[PDB]
Write a protein that binds this DNA or RNA. Sequence first.
DNA 1: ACTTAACAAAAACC
DNA 2: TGGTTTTTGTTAAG
DNA 3: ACTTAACAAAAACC
DNA 4: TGGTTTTTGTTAAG
Lengths: 68, 68
Amino acid sequence: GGRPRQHLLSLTRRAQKHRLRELKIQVKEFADKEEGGDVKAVCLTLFLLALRARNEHRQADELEAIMQ
Amino acid sequence: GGRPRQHLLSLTRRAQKHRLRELKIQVKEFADKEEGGDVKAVCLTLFLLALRARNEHRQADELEAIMQ
DNA sequence: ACTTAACAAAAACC
DNA sequence: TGGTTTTTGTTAAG
DNA sequence: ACTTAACAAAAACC
DNA sequence: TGGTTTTTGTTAAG
């Protein structure tokens, strides 16, 4: 069978890191090939656009206030 | 030749969306296959772990205060 | 610190 | 007991 | 609103 | 003028 997966957000940073391991690589590969290795700006923008795609403008604005 | 790319963070949300278009798909595909289609939690965690990997704990804490 | 991979063991499933 | 996968932490390396 | 793809045109490069 | 790619916005569809 295998142990059931807990929600990503409930996991330790260690276990969270283990689950995204493969996507972290794909993101790295993309950022390198297309955005001059700027993972932060890429993940920041993915997250921002993911928020605004969901109409969470208030949260997106607050994150945009934090990042400057 | 082709027009030089501006920095991702200087672009309009429209143009930003156009550049990440392909990574947005890979992220979608991953979230669906591995995280029950939870793009937000995935991008949130990628960004958080990207911040803490860079020792930007203060910013990561503030984003973690915003998201609850 | 952070990262990484390896070695472990416990946990939760069959 | 056996299996598995997930979760954690430690351990040994950058 | 958001999304998407299409159609446009201007911009910045050759 | 031609080419290209990028940037924007609009347009027509969910």
